[PDB]
Amino acid sequence: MENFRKVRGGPGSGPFADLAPGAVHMRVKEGSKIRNLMAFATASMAQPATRAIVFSGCGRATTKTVTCAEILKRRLAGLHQVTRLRYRSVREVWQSASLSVLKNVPGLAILLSKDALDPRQPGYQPPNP
Amino acid sequence: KYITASTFAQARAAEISAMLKAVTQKSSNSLVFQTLPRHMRRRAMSHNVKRLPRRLQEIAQKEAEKAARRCHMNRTLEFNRRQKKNIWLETHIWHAKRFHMVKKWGYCLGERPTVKSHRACYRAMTNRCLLQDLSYYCCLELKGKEEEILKALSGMCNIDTGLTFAAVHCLSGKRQGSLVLYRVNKYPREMLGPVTFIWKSQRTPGDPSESRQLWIWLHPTLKQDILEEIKAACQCVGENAKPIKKIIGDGTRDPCLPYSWISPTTGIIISDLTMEMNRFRLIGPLSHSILTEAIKAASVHTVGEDTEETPHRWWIETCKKPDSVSLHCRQEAIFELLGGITSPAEIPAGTILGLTVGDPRINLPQKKSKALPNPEKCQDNEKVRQLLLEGVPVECTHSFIWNQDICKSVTENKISDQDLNRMRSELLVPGSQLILGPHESKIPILLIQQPGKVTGEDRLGWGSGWDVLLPKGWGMAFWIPFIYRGVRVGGLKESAVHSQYKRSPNVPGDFPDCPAGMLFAEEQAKNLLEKYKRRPPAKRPNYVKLGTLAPFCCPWEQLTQDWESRVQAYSHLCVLRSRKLLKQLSAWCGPSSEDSRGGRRAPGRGQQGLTREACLSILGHFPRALVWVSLSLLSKGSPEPHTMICVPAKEDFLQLHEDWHYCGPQESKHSDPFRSKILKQKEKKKREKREALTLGLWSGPLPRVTLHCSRTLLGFVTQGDFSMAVGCGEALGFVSLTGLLDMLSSQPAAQRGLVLLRPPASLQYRFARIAIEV
Amino acid sequence: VRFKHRYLLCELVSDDPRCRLSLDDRVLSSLVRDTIARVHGTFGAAACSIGFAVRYLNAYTGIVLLRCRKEFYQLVWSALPFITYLENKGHRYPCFFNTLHVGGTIRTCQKFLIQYNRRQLLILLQNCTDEGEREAIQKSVTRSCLL
Amino acid sequence: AVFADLDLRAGSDLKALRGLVETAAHLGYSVVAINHIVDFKEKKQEIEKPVAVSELFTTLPIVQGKSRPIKILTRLTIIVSDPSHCNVLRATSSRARLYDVVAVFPKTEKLFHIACTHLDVDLVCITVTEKLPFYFKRPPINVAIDRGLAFELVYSPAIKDSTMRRYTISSALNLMQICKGKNVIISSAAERPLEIRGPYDVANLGLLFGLSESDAKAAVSTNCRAALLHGETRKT
Amino acid sequence: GAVEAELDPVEYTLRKRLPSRLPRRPNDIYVNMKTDFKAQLARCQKLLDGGARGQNACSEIYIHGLGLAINRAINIALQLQAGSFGSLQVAANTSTVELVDELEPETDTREPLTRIRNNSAIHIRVFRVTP
RNA sequence: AUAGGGCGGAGGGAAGCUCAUCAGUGGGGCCACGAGCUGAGUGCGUCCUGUCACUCCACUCCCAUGUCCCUUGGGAAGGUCUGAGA
RNA sequence: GCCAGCGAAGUGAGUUCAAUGGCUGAGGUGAGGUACCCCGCAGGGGACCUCAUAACCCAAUUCAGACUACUCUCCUCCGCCCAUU
């Protein structure tokens, strides 16, 4: 039961890493991590940091990262969010005889920002609620 | 340049093909009269040129350059003389103008459309708009004191097993109830029938002191059945004149009917009314939008301030109170708020809302079949959420045309429509809407909506429709503006697909009961017997050799006798319409899987557990059980009417678990010794010339249904058809629980609902899945 | 009062676009008749003298749409692979290949040709990676969207 | 119902191999299986690294249809005339376990009898060039169709001669009339860079061979997957 | 009353009155549940290649999805982008949908109750951008 | 009397064999929601801290682009007939 | 006698340089033969094999009615001729 996951935010992570945001990862299926990440979002709303929030999700958790990052949008009321959709390769070894299998899962990233996207959007068209 | 010239050549070929087929499909053999759409084709364009549009008439005149008696009577008097026999509704002539009208158990009604629209009716039923004509629903209006009508409904109710309608009082002020009533409280399982029930309590008393109304709406054969039940239960005591009422009712108006009597003892006033008011079922999501845009609330301002000359003084007497103006304003605001809602699909259960409507022939758009969606402005989200959460129309439920004298004064107006057609042409306006208002039709109408498949959890609220309730005078006048907007009309076949697609039984006669189901089954058996004697031999297959007693839909009366004899050895038509035991049966028949403990999920938020003695204890209190079942074909099947549901063996389980894509085994042939008997009867007949049995009828229904086939048959299907709601065969059929408990006790293992079926015309068995979602 | 016609599409697959430029209706008709006369006798080839005829031809594209009867399209489509050794002004080796057999119905045959052309455009794009052809591809997509 | 599975006899150089792979991927093929002709005179066994497709091709062949990755198989066609050479092939059942489908080519009727009776093979090659008459006994064909033996018919006389066309069509009609037509697949050899035919054309070309109006296409589309499954069960 | 024996129907979730207009000029695709994956992907491939046959002309599509239908929608989208083989732009829009549930036991004294829920819907928008 | 054999003519809102597999053309259909929106349980932390991990506990497994299903020219589909679909 | 049209999606087949009754096997019916099986009123019922299941004609918007062209096929009114009691 040993898995290795390779991600194929590639050009987009540069201007974020120029400002060092808080990274969020949701692996497969976990309940109290939603409350923990909402607690860190409520804390980082008050802590001094730039308007840049990063969410990432792979596997079945590609539904859950849509849910919890919605909830912060009901509280923080963000303006510009980019949802990126890419391939992720999961090579996992398990036993029934040890066998390895390579699956292809979707990976969903959510980028919340206000001012970094104001010179942007000729092409990408993020939603502006 | 190899690849570049190849790219230019492929682009030129794509352009040539894309333009060529698009021009050629609109060309249609270079004929202008065939260029029109196929729904909009009239074959009388060769006789007179006016059947084509004017821009096309200017071409048709050049194409024509290139290429029985009158009515001698009063047609109203002929229609009255013919209406002396039949019913002849106001919109019946509109239906008979372009739909098939067939005589039935009551009046002659629409069976099928003249144009082939069987896929088009479903396509208009899903996304677009479609309406019906529902006038057969007879109404029992009951009046009385608050304590006596509750007793008269408690003698008939059976709340303890059925759905709550009378003593609940919280569902009554907002919405209606729709359920099945019963007979006298001996509880014999004999009489049953679906009845749509309406309460209304006024807002001002708030106490048992005034006169409480209640409404029963039902079916004409059910009217003949339940009118005697109410009578035994409660108490035993020169211009053109348009026949708006029924001539049977008009001729019985002097001796007996309509049945409006009182009671001195118990104070129950009974009003059986066959045709007093009409109802129209508009089904569709876009139907709500065009009903918002067409039906508009009348202005209370201009009439209420100073406009009063000559009669309709009742609107002045109503508008004299200051609360009526704000009430009509709130009704118009909530109507526009309902118009802001994107669909009639999100609404709890059959709500009721009535208001005053200025008649929809004021606008009358010039085009025909002009269907548009809403504008992109979809604001006011908070009030929509407030209406979806609570939805409390207590104040807006206004009963104005339900009275005895006011609705008759509405009907007494005797409005014309051809003259109103001419008044618009006398104004000579090209495209504007101008109707003068010294005297307008400021009358109220009711809207009772219907959610469909609320019980079934497969679609969760499929059939969203509205019900326009209106008086008998304002009939076809309110019909035709929707037709001009572009609403399609479906007949009894559209109600049949509304039943079978929503997996509900048909309310006239397709469910078995004693007075209605047996007579409807005999009436359908007469048509099938006429088609059977109409067809000669060597065309149809014999049912002796391959099948059994089919398709005559009454053999289960001796099938259930064999089942109860097999149960007891080792009251009739008892239908288990009790929702708790139906959920318990859904807990077994629905999920067919084993992972750790239970079906399809281990927690489930339910109570899983096997007890066979508790299942056998149900049959002790409920003899001769019969439950309807939604059955779904997995693959390779097209169901016919009257398919017999057969219990699978263990070898079928092994062969289906062995390989996927496996068809059912064939049925062995049976002995047919009756052919020599029919030949001897023919020889005796031709002997005596110089019990009519042709090819598979005989008087032997008892020993066969016990054990004839190689498999055990337990289930009979009324509506067997493929639905486009799933994309495969989806049938609905009546089974017995005494055969299903043996099926459930036979398999604690894997898939349990996989039960075979056999159509009568074929010898092939096809497996399907059983569901009971009530 | 009518006869159910059948139609067939065939792509000429070859390099050296002088072979792409060397097409004619009479030459192709005589070629198909001569190569059926080698395979089939009088009964096979003479039925192609009345039923078979050239219908649609493109020089650069190489897609040929041909007619054929109800009782003879099996014989014609079985005679199609044996079209070998076209001798001409140069030493060429052209060869036909069937895309899909359409049962008459010219309109959906032209519909299937458009999707086949779109598949022939879009798949060739990623393997080449050249902007000089990509500009003409963008112009073709723009002109198709104008339609 | 896996379509576009046929066999090729093609190796000269890497350029012609790339051209034939691109031609097969463009026209009608989704699985390409390369045969290697080995006669009884040479008796050479080079199994370890003779071909090396994946180390030399570029990462994918792309087709014009469904756009799926092509599985590429390496098969061996062994011409066996002498009975001692068949004993050499009997000796190779445990020595080198590669070449997933083993394809024998018999010339002696006793050798064809013991090939269908005792010898563990996957698909028997039947080609007739330059006057090779051959009879057929029905119970070994019955044991063969009960086992899973699919009969290969490799044809390419269409460019070279017409007498070879006559002998191939005569052998094909004799096989269809005697063998009853249960599992026979037809395939093309590629010596010249243009010796390939249409994907749907295999159905009408087997119809010219006979066997049904439809069971040519049905039998190739079923029996190629059945032969791959039989070679997989022989390997495992 | 909601524990012993009650009726629990789910009524509807608002999307807009947009899909009366959305199949005319653009294309819209709704992903349902437990029906079929391969049928949905085949209908996506059929509607994508439609020119003067599909609705009017393929120019742009976008796919709707709810709580698990977002996962099946991102699955069919990321397999369709591998299948269609062309350079297509994929942009996702996140929205909040209000869900209403009704519950009522069968008793002459009880009253019905409505539960509110919030769901996350996605709109996966595919443009035909030049390669 | 045996309508036993042969032929012809008249009337019936008379009807114009079915099913399953393999295969060919065309058409139709294939329903936004796992009561997982602050989900639950377990081990270290913790009792007021989870860029911790596990259980496809909701099997939705499979290189997923259809091994999916249905039906498919009648009494007459023919008349340069009638009428209706305003 | 005269007077009334709608350019926007897509007919339980909807094509138009004009698709859709294709093959196999068992049962239906009209018939013949029996060395098969079960039952005891000379016999009756089922089982096995073969032949025949055609013609008229073909839909482009539908339906109702009338017409003309039918004969594997079924309900009757019949006529003539041949043979028997």
Strand F contact at CB of residue E117, distance < 7 A: yes
Both tokens assigned to B378? 């979809």
Which E residues between 53 and 72 have a beta carbon under 7 A from any strand G atom? Answer: 53-55
CB contact under 8 A, C127 and D208: no
Q: How far apart are the first and last CA of chain D?
A: 23
Judged by CB atoms within 8 Å, which residues 10-39 of D form the interface with C?
23, 26-28
CB B710 within 8 A of CB B667: yes
Nearest-angstrom CA–CA distance, B205 and B209: 7
Residues of E with CB under 8 A from a CB of B: 5, 7, 9-17, 19-21, 39, 51-52, 98, 100, 102, 106-108, 111-112, 114, 116
CB B688 within 8 A of CB B704: no
Distances in Å between the Cα of B229 and the Cα atoms of B156, B192, B235, D94 are 9, 11, 10, 91
Which amino acid is it at B435? I
Strand order in the sheet with B177-182: B177-182, B192-200, B212-218, B138-144, B268-273, B259-261
DSSP secondary structure string, B715-770?
EEEEE--EETTTTEEEEEEEE-HHHHHHHHHH-SSS--S-EEEE-TT--B-EEEEE
Phi-psi region of B616 (alpha: psi -120 to 50; beta: other; left: phi over 0): alpha
In this complex, the residue of C84, C100, C127 whose CB is nearest that of residue D159 is C84
CB contact under 8 A, C137 and E128: no
Nucleotides of strand G under 7 angstroms from a protein beta carbon: 1, 3-12, 14-20, 22, 27-30, 44-47, 53, 58-63, 72-77
CA of B612 to C1' of F33 (A): 36
B650 part of contact set with chain E, CB < 8 Å:
no
CB contact under 8 A, B388 and E98: yes
DSSP secondary structure string, B297-316?
EPPSHHHHHT--SSS--HHH
CB B594 within 8 A of CB B732: no
Q: Name every residue whose Cβ is closer than 8 Å to that of residue C1 and which is 6 or more positions away in sequence.
A: none
Nearest-angstrom CA–CA distance, B583 and B586: 5
Nucleotides of strand F under 7 angstroms from a protein beta carbon: 1-4, 14-42, 49-55, 57-60, 62-71, 73, 82-86
CATH assignment at residue D117:
3.20.20.140
Rg, C-alpha atoms of chain A? 16
Strand F contact at CB of residue E18, distance < 7 A: no
Strand G contact at CB of residue B368, distance < 7 A: yes
Q: Name every residue whose Cβ is closer than 8 Å to that of residue A72 and which is 6 or more positions away in sequence.
A: A38, A41, A53, A78, A112
Strand F contact at CB of residue A35, distance < 7 A: yes
From chain C, pick out residues whose CB is under 8 angstroms from the CB of E131.
Answer: 125-126, 134, 137-138
Helices (H), ranges, chain A: 13-17, 32-46, 64-73
Helices (H), ranges, B45-145: 54-66, 75-83, 92-98, 118-126
| Domain of D26, in residue numbers | 5-235
| Minimum CA–C1' distance nucleotide for A72 | F38
The closest alpha carbon to B368, from B96, B114, B39, belongs to: B39
CB contact under 8 A, E51 and C114: yes
Resolution for the entry shown, Å: 3.9
Q: Where are the beta strands (DSSP E) in B244-351?
A: 259-261, 268-273, 277-283, 296-297
CB contact under 8 A, E57 and C145: yes
The closest alpha carbon to C9, from C101, C119, C108, C103, belongs to: C101
Structure determination technique employed = cryo-EM
Number of domains into which chain D is organized = 1
CB contact under 8 A, D26 and C82: no
| Minimum CA–C1' distance nucleotide for B119 | G12
Rg, C-alpha atoms of chain E? 19
CA angle B352, B354, B355 (to 5 degrees): 160
Nearest-angstrom CA–CA distance, B409 and B443: 11
CB contact under 8 A, D204 and C85: no
Which amino acid is it at B369? S
The closest alpha carbon to C144, from B535, B17, D63, belongs to: B17
Nearest-angstrom CA–CA distance, B293 and B289: 6
* Residue nearest F20 (alpha carbon to C1'): B764
Helix axes B492-501, B118-126, angle to 10 degrees: 60
**In 3-state terms, what secondary structure has residue D74?**
strand
Nearest-angstrom CA–CA distance, B24 and B39: 19
CB B180 within 8 A of CB B192: yes
Among E120, E127, E128, E129, the strongest candidate for a mutation testing the A interface, having the largest count of A CBs within 10 A, is E120
Question: How many CB pairs below 8 Å do chains B and E form together?
Answer: 73
Largest CA distance in chain C: 55
Nearest chain A residue (CA) to E78: A106
